[PDB]
Design a protein around this nucleic acid. Sequence first.
DNA 1: ATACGCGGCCGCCCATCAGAATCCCGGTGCCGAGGCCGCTCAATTGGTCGTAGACAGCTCTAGCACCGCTTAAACGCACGTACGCGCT
Length: 82
Amino acid sequence: GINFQRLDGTVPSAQRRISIDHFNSPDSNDFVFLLSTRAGGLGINLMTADTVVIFDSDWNPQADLQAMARAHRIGQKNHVMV
DNA sequence: ATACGCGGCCGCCCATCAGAATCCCGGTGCCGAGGCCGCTCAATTGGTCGTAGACAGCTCTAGCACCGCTTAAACGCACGTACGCGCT
C-alpha cells in the first residue's frame, strides 16, 4: 500500500514530466520516488525529497554525489539523511 | 429212318514268378581358411643436433553489458480474391 511512481529510461517525457510535476506538489501522497543512475542523475531536481537510500555504488566515483544532488539541494530545509 | 452222346469252349476261383519302387545307407565337387615360404627392401634400432613450440609475462584490443531516446518493423486481425486441389 505504498503510493509511488517510477522514473527510468523507458517512459517518454510526457509521462515523466507528469510524474515529476505530481511529486513536487506539497500535498502529494508519494513519499517514495524511484530513480536510476544515468536517468536518476540525468537532470532536474527534487525539492521536497530529503532522504536518499542507495542500494550499492554504481561503479563510478562522484556519481553518488551527483545522484544525491537531485534531492539534496538548496530548497531542502529539513536536512538530508543518506 | 430217328434218337443219344460229346467236344472243345469258357467263366470261375486259385496257384507261381518276375519286376517296379521306397527306404537304408553314399560318393563327389566346390569354397574358403591354412601352410608354406623366401628373397628383401621398408620399418626399427640406437644416436646426434637444433629448433618449434610450450609456457609464462605482459599489454592492450574488442567483446560484453547496460541504458534510454526514437521508430521502423513486426504483430494480429478483418475481408475477399484468386489459387490449390479434386473431379471428370
